[PDB]
Structures are given as C-alpha cells and as structure tokens.
Amino acid sequence: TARFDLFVVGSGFFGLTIAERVATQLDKRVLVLERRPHIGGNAYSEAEPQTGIEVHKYGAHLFHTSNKRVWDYVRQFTDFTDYRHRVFAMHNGQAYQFPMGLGLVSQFFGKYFTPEQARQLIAEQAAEIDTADAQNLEEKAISLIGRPLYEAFVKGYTAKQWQTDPKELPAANITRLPVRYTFDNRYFSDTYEGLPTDGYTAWLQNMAADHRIEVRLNTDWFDVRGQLRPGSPAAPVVYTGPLDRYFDYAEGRLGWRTLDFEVEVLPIGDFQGTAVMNYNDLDVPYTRIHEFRHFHPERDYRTDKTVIMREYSRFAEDDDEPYYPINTEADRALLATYRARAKSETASSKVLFGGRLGTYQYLDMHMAIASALNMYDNVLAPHLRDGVPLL
Amino acid sequence: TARFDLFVVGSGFFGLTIAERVATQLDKRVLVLERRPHIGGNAYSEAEPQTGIEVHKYGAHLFHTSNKRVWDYVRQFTDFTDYRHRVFAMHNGQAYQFPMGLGLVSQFFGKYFTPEQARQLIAEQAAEIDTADAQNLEEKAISLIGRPLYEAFVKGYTAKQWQTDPKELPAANITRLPVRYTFDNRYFSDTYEGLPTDGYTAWLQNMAADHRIEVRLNTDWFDVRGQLRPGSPAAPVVYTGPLDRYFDYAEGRLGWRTLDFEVEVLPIGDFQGTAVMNYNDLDVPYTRIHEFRHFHPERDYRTDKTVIMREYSRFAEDDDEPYYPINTEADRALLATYRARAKSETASSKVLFGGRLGTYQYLDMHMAIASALNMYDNVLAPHLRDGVPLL
Numbered sequence: 186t187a188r189f190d191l192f193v194v195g196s197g198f199f200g201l202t203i204a205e206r207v208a209t210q211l212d213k214r215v216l217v218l219e220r221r222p223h224i225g226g227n228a229y230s231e232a233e234p235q236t237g238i239e240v241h242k243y244g245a246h247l248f249h250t251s252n253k254r255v256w257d258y259v260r261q262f263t264d265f266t267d268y269r270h271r272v273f274a275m276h277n278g279q280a281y282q283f284p285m286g287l288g289l290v291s292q293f294f295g296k297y298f299t300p301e302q303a304r305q306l307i308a309e310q311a312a313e314i315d316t317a318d319a320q321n322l323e324e325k326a327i328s329l330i331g332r333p334l335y336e337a338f339v340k341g342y343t344a345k346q347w348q349t350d351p352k353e354l355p356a357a358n359i360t361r362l363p364v365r366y367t368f369d370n371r372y373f374s375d376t377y378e379g380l381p382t383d384g385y386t387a388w389l390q391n392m393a394a395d396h397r398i399e400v401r402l403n404t405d406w407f408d409v410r411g412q413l414r415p416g417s418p419a420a421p422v423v424y425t426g427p428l429d430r431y432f433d434y435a436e437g438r439l440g441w442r443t444l445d446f447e448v449e450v451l452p453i454g455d456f457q458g459t460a461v462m463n464y465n466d467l468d469v470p471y472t473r474i475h476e477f478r479h480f481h482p483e484r485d486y487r488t489d490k491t492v493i494m495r496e497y498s499r500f501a502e503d504d505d506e507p508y509y510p511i512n513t514e515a516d517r518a519l520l521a522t523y524r525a526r527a528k529s530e531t532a533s534s535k536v537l538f539g540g541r542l543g544t545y546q547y548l549d550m551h552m553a554i555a556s557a558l559n560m561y562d563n564v565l566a567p568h569l570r571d572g573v574p575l576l
Numbered sequence: 577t578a579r580f581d582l583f584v585v586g587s588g589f590f591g592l593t594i595a596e597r598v599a600t601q602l603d604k605r606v607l608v609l610e611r612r613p614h615i616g617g618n619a620y621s622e623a624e625p626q627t628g629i630e631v632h633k634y635g636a637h638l639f640h641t642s643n644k645r646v647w648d649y650v651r652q653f654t655d656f657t658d659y660r661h662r663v664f665a666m667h668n669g670q671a672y673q674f675p676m677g678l679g680l681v682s683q684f685f686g687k688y689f690t691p692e693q694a695r696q697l698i699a700e701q702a703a704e705i706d707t708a709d710a711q712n713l714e715e716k717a718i719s720l721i722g723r724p725l726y727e728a729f730v731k732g733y734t735a736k737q738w739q740t741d742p743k744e745l746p747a748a749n750i751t752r753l754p755v756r757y758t759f760d761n762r763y764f765s766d767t768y769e770g771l772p773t774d775g776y777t778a779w780l781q782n783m784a785a786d787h788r789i790e791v792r793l794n795t796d797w798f799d800v801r802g803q804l805r806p807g808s809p810a811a812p813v814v815y816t817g818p819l820d821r822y823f824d825y826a827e828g829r830l831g832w833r834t835l836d837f838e839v840e841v842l843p844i845g846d847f848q849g850t851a852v853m854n855y856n857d858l859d860v861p862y863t864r865i866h867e868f869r870h871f872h873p874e875r876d877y878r879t880d881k882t883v884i885m886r887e888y889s890r891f892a893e894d895d896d897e898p899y900y901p902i903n904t905e906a907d908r909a910l911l912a913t914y915r916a917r918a919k920s921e922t923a924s925s926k927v928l929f930g931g932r933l934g935t936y937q938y939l940d941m942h943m944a945i946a947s948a949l950n951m952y953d954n955v956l957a958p959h960l961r962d963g964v965p966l967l
C-alpha cells in the first residue's frame with residue numbers, strides 16, 4: 186500500500202542518476218521533487234529563439250571523464266559530439282594560449298621555449314615553495330606555474346571568482362587545471378569528452394523518462410515531506426539540496442559562491458572567435474565570456490547573429506542559489522558538524538546526503554554521476570533489495 | 577588460360593585501391609608490381625627500434641576527408657584515432673599559432689583582435705589584388721592573408737620548398753591552407769580526420785591481403801612488361817609511376833620537387849612539444865621538423881627518448897623520387913603533350929594513368945583514393961565486366 190519506494194530531492198545529475206538506477210534496475214517507484222520549474226539543476230539548457238543556439242542557462246557545462254563505466258552509462262541517454270574544450274585568456278589587451286603550456290610561456294616571455302627550457306624557467310620561478318608542501322591555492326599555484334605567471338593569470342582571476350585570500354583557499358582548486366610543458370591546449374585531460382548532441386535538457390529528460398519515475402516541479406521538499414513520508418513510511422530519502430539549509434543553518438551558514446549571468450544576442454556573426462575567453466585582469470568585472478555558437482562547430486547557425494554570456498561572481502546570499510563551496514578552514518569545521526548531524530539523520534530517518542550541495546564538495550557532472558553510482562551500488566541497492574542497514 | 581586479369585604499376589594508395597576493388601568486387605586476379613622493396617609508396621611507415629614510435633619514412637602523412645564514401649571505404653582496412661592535426665610556425669625565435677587566424681594575428685601584431693577587427697585589418701592589407709583575380713600563388717596568398725603576414729610566413733617558406741618564383745606557382749597551392757578569422761587552429765577543415773590506429777603499413781597490407789592480389793616487390797614494370805603482357809593479352813594496365821618517365825622523357829622532363837629527410841633519436845623526452853613545427857625563416861635550411869611521439873598522444877612511449885625528423889626540399893634529379901609537381905606554365909604545356917600520348921596509349925595498348933605521379937597532380941591520400949574509386953566505377957569495371965571500351 187506504499188505509494189513510493191524512494192524519495193529524491195533534486196533533479197540534478199546526482200538525483201536523476203539515483204532515480205534512474207533504482208527504477209530500472211530494482212523495478213521500484215521513485216518520486217523526484219524539484220524546487221525549480223525545470224529539471225536538470227544547473228545543467229539545464231535552452232535554445233535561444235533568434236538563433237536556435239543552445240544556451241547553458243546556469244553557466245557553461247562541459248562534460249569530460251576517464252571513467253569508462255560512467256562514460257558507458259551516460260551514452261545510454263544521449264550521444265556526444267567530438268568537441269574538445271579549449272580556453273583562451275585575456276591579459277593587458279592580448280589573448281593568450283591557456284592553460285599552462287609552451288604557447289602561454291612563449292607569448293608571455295616573448296620568445297620560444299623548448300620543453301626543457303620551459304621546465305627550467307618555471308623551476309627557477311617556483312623556488313619559494315615545493316608542490317608537495319603546499320597548504321593552499323596560492324602555494325600550490327606558484328609551485329606549479331611560477332610567480333610571474335601566477336600574478337598575471339591567477340591573482341586577478343582568483344580575486345574576482347572567490348573574493349577570498351588565496352592562502353585560505355584549497356590547493357585542490359588550482360589542480361583542476363592541467364600543468365603542461367607542450368603546445369597542447371586542451372583544457373581537460375580526460376579520456377572521454379564531448380557535448381550532448383541534442384542538448385543537455387534532452388539528456389536529462391531521458392534519464393527521468395521511465396514511467397516508474399515521477400517528477401514534481403515547483404515543489405519544495407520541506408513543504409511536502411510531512412505528508413508524503415507517512416504515505417510511504419519505509420521509503421528512504423536522497424537529499425541533494427544545501428546541507429546547511431536542511432538543518433535550517435543550526436550551527437551556522439556555510440560559505441558559498443554564486444554567479445550572475447548576462448546573456449546578450451549581438452547583431453554580429455562572431456564576437457570573440459572562440460567558446461570561452463577568460464578575463465584575468467581586474468579592470469573588468471566579469472570573470473569570463475561564453476560564446477555558445479563555438480560550442481557546436483559541427484552545427485551551422487545564422488552568421489548575422491551571435492549569443493554571448495558574461496559571468497559574474499559574488500557571495501551567495503540567503504535567496505541566492507549556491508554554485509561553489511568556499512571550503513575555508515572555518516567552513517570545513519562547520520562542515521564536520523553538519524556531517525555528524527547528517528550521519529544521525531541517516532540512522533534516525535533514513536536520509537542520505539549526496540551531490541555538490543548535499544556534501545559541500547566541488548563536484549563536476551561526471552564526478553556527481555560516479556558518486557551517485559557508488560551510493561547506489563554500496564548503500565541504496567543493498568537496502569532496497571536485501572534490507573541492509575543504510576549506514 | 578590468361579594468368580592475370582589486370583596489371584597494376586605501383587603499390588601506393590591509388591594502385592592498392594584499384595587492385596582491391598577489382599579483386600574483391602569483380603572476382604578477378606590482379607598483379608601488382610612495385611619498384612621499391614616495400615608497399616604503400618610514400619605512406620610506408622616503420623617503427624623506430626629504440627622507442628617503438630611509428631616513423632613516416634617518406635614524410636609525415638595525415639589523413640583527412642569530407643567524402644563519406646571514401647571514409648567508409650578506408651575504415652574497412654583500419655581504425656582511426658581521434659587525432660586532430662595542428663601546426664605551429666617558427667619565426668624570429670618565436671613560435672606562432674598557425675595557420676591564418678586570431679591567434680596568429682594577435683601574436684604577430686601585438687594585441688587582441690576581434691573577428692571583425694581582424695577582417696578589417698586583413699582587408700586593408702590585401703588591397704593590391706582581389707582573391708578572384710589571382711593568377712598565381714603570390715597573388716592568391718596576399719589576397720587572402722595580406723602582405724605583412726605573407727612576407728613573414730609564406731615568402732621564406734615557399735622559397736625553401738619550391739625554389740621557384742611565387743608568381744609562377746599555382747594559386748591552388750596556397751588554398752590548401754584554411755583561411756580563418758577564429759581561434760580555431762585545426763590545420764585541416766575536413767569532416768573526418770585521424771591516424772591509422774595500428775600504423776599505415778598495416779593499413780596498406782590489409783588492402784593487398786586478398787589472395788587474388790599478387791604483389792611483386794623490387795620489380796620494375798618496364799623490365800618485365802615485355803614478358804608479362806603476352807601471358808595475359810587482354811589484361812589492361814593501371815600505371816601510377818611518373819608520366820614523363822613512361823614515355824622516356826620524349827618531349828622533355830616535367831619539373832618535380834623531392835625531399836631529403838634527417839631522422840634522429842634524441843636522448844630527451846620531448847624536443848618541441850608538438851607534432852609539426854614549421855620554419856618560415858631563411859636562416860635555417862629545413863622547412864619543418866616532425867616529432868612523431870606527438871602523432872599518437874593516446875600512446876605512451878619512453879620519456880627519455882624521442883624521434884624527430886627534419887625535412888629538406890630540392891629539385892628532383894633523375895635518380896630522385898618525385899614528391900611534388902611544380903606545375904609552372906612551361907610544365908603545364910609539357911603535361912598537355914603527355915596527356916595526348918597517354919590518351920593514345922589507352923586506345924592502343926589499354927594503359928590507364930592515375931595517381932600523383934601518373935597525372936602530374938597535387939594529390940593527397942584521400943584524393944587519390946577517391947580518384948581510384950572513380951576510375952574503377954566509370955572506366956575499369958565497365959570494361960572488365962561488360963567489355964566497354966576504356967575511353
């Protein structure tokens with residue numbers, strides 16, 4: 186007589202992966218509850234009416250992974266193009282090859298450097314701190330790319346994105362970018378990469394297309410959990426919303442970063458001649474500019490119009506939507522207290538916590554999907570199928 | 577009682593395509609005669625013993641095509657990697673993004689140019705001649721990329737490759753390179769591109785693997801045609817050797833360009849950090865340098881050794897192997913006389929002429945394969961199957 190076998194809070198890639206796996210592999214009924222008027226979370230996309238160009242409404246999303254299982258899993262719901270993401274950096278009125286590589290070095294220092302000459306120069310300029318003993322973002326970056334490059338391509342950019350002292354930011358944030366001594370300027374270094382052939386929304390709709398999956402939009406979990414859970418007493422709950430918001434900020438508010446976007450349809454065919462242009466200087470407010478027509482070069486759009494998007498970073502207010510965890514020393518101490526409360530909620534009320542917002546972690550699409558598969562394999566499936574305790 | 581149904585002179589991509597199609601689609605026996613001690617022509621490759629790195633013995637060969645039929649045809653004999661060829665240009669001790677694009681323009685002129693600002697600058701600097709009215713290479717290049725770029729990236733390079741006045745060289749030679757106003761630096765602009773997964777030699781061996789195809793190496797056609805053709809009187813002949821050499825240079829010698837190579841195994845892991853580096857300046861003898869480890873970035877070779885190859889251009893002597901047709905006005909006049917003789921040989925002795933050497937034409941791998949398929953479909957197959965006259 187139980188209506189649902191599982192509750193899922195959030196229709197992001199983590200939530201949809203969980204819902205899809207439980208519904209199709211266990212033949213169970215899943216209710217997905219979404220606060221927003223649309224599914225997919227921040228991966229939600231829409232076609233711009235004038236051009237037909239797919240616009241990433243919540244910031245550019247580029248898919249990439251070296252996990253074969255994840256790669257094989259996502260291909261069940263969408264095809265991928267042969268797109269290879271590349272980023273250019275604007276500094277002092279000049280566009281630079283990016284990231285760290287022979288192109289960047291040769292441009293910034295005025296002459297060509299062999300792979301060995303480049304390693305030497307950097308080694309010299311990284312002498313202050315070694316890579317292994319780097320506590321924070323600043324120590325890590327300087328140890329990897331040297332100081333003169335750090336000031337001209339990291340200092341200003343980091344200040345605009347976090348508004349937090351780099352000595353207080355995690356070192357893992359900078360290791361997201363590949364450190365290279367070749368002319369290769371692929372922004373990612375994963376085995377598999379590409380954009381959804383028919384868009385992200387179509388991809389996300391396929392994952393929730395199963396008839397055993399019900400998605401209720403414009404619905405807040407905390408407004409309806411009092412009535413739904415009695416309808417299905419034994420049904421566990423997978424929560425992917427903000428971790429601190431779940432406990433009503435009892436111990437305090439975790440530091441988040443949010444983003445403002447500026448979408449504009451220009452009466453020209455090409456604005457910058459590339460997909461993403463980073464702006465490292467402080468004389469400009471936005472961190473970077475996206476031109477979505479270059480996301481799909483295999484497609485042919487009108488050559489008299491183009492759609493660009495400028496990106497702005499600031500602290501996430503109470504009514505803002507959290508995009509990036511800050512993870513300072515104070516933030517991590519607060520996180521540990523919420524992790525304890527979360528661990529108690531699992532034992533007391535069968536509530537699991539996952540996703541970027543649910544765990545306060547810097548998660549990409551492929552990392553959240555992989556994390557969702559792990560939670561399913563090791564936690565959810567043994568419980569829903571064999572009755573194994575959730576923790 | 578006829579031993580062979582077809583004679584093929586040359587085991588290049590043109591010759592092997594012809595042989596493979598006739599043998600498998602018509603169930604006919606084909607004799608392939610090769611002057612060299614190996615098959616594949618200039619596409620022949622070998623693994624360097626110290627590293628295991630595939631070396632293109634007769635110059636770097638990059639496959640690319642927009643022809644779906646050709647693409648589907650070649651995949652029957654080999655797989656292709658996701659390799660995308662890119663070339664960098666060395667000038668005045670600095671490495672430049674190549675070819676014509678926003679990267680090159682921004683580097684050479686000292687500041688960033690928008691796609692519109694770039695079109696303006698070039699337009700100004702191309703004012704002398706318009707693209708449509710370009711008679712030769714020099715007029716075509718200047719009309720496309722402007723003069724200051726022409727002198728710094730085309731003048732010196734063209735002088736080293738052809739040693740012929742650019743006003744006397746074909747305009748089609750420069751249109752091989754994509755003219756761009758974006759940051760895209762893909763050297764080719766075809767739909768399909770990649771390198772043979774298991775090497776070129778394995779690819780070529782598969783095309784001639786059929787039991788109805790016999791390949792005789794170290795055999796010159798003109799030494800054995802007197803005895804072979806009586807053995808198979810009705811068998812046509814597909815000749816892919818030098819057109820003028822076939823008629824013993826009766827009307828004169830066509831102008832060809834040959835190449836000398838300098839292969840070296842260096843005691844370092846990386847020489848230039850990219851596959852191909854062009855040298856546009858005259859203060860260096862070689863036209864470009866290839867580093868073959870970057871041809872296959874999906875592979876992992878030893879990091880203490882690397883194999884490079886320097887390329888030198890000069891006029892093809894009598895004992896040299898012709899690589900590039902010069903095609904001056906005098907050359908084309910001589911070609912017209914050989915085309916008439918060739919047309920007579922087809923009527924009198926059933927001898928077809930194809931390939932880069934057989935037609936004195938600037939042919940790529942995909943263009944020769946496509947040309948071979950056309951000759952098969954429209955000429956050879958109707959003759960060998962229905963008895964239709966060859967011309």
Ligand SMILES: Cc1cc2nc3c(=O)[nH]c(=O)nc-3n(C[C@H](O)[C@H](O)[C@H](O)COP(=O)(O)OP(=O)(O)OC[C@H]3O[C@@H](n4cnc5c(N)ncnc54)[C@H](O)[C@@H]3O)c2cc1C
Nearest residue numbers: 195197198199220226227244246247406426540541549550
């Ligand atoms: C600006 C930005 C850029 C990114 N770029 C990339 C990229 O380039 N490549 C890449 O691989 N990844 C990228 N990511 C990461 C990726 O978008 C997400 O991690 C991904 O969607 C994974 O799912 P998630 O569960 O963390 O969903 P999230 O989208 O982080 O959000 C999950 C959902 O929970 C819902 N929710 C929250 N609270 C409630 C509630 N109370 N009731 C109901 N629903 C609720 C929200 O509506 C939200 O839709 C980016 C993320 C951001 C923010």
Ligand SMILES: Cc1cc2nc3c(=O)[nH]c(=O)nc-3n(C[C@H](O)[C@H](O)[C@H](O)COP(=O)(O)OP(=O)(O)OC[C@H]3O[C@@H](n4cnc5c(N)ncnc54)[C@H](O)[C@@H]3O)c2cc1C
Nearest residue numbers: 586588589590611617618635637638797817931932940941
């Ligand atoms: C230096 C160079 C670089 C190239 N790079 C590329 C590239 O990057 N991408 C691309 O798509 N294409 C490239 N090509 C083109 C390509 O290599 C050839 O066009 C291709 O092999 C097509 O076949 P072909 O018949 O023209 O054979 P070719 O190799 O031009 O030669 C055909 C064969 O005829 C044989 N032969 C000649 N005379 C006799 C005789 N009397 N008896 C017996 N045999 C004879 C020769 O041994 C030779 O092997 C390049 C060519 C050269 C020369």
Ligand SMILES: O=c1ccn([C@@H]2O[C@H](COP(=O)(O)OP(=O)(O)O[C@H]3O[C@H](CO)[C@H](O)C(F)(F)C3(F)F)[C@@H](O)[C@H]2O)c(=O)[nH]1
Nearest residue numbers: 245246247272274338339342343346358359361461463465
């Ligand atoms: O020019 C730069 C670029 C980055 N950084 C530092 O690296 C950190 C992370 O860089 P990222 O590019 O990974 O930042 P993200 O916003 O998470 O990455 C998004 O932006 C990219 C746009 O090309 C991609 O869309 C993406 F995949 F990496 C992203 F979507 F997640 C930054 O926070 C900053 O501190 C710099 O310091 N300077």
Ligand SMILES: O=c1ccn([C@@H]2O[C@H](COP(=O)(O)OP(=O)(O)O[C@H]3O[C@H](CO)[C@H](O)C(F)(F)C3(F)F)[C@@H](O)[C@H]2O)c(=O)[nH]1
Nearest residue numbers: 636637638663665729730733734737749750752852854856
């Ligand atoms: O820097 C340059 C480069 C090219 N050129 C002009 O374009 C003409 C053709 O350029 P190409 O690159 O097509 O010359 P090719 O030798 O036929 O091309 C070979 O070299 C390339 C190496 O990256 C590729 O391997 C290839 F495919 F294009 C090639 F094998 F055929 C040149 O003859 C020259 O006049 C220049 O003037 N300057």
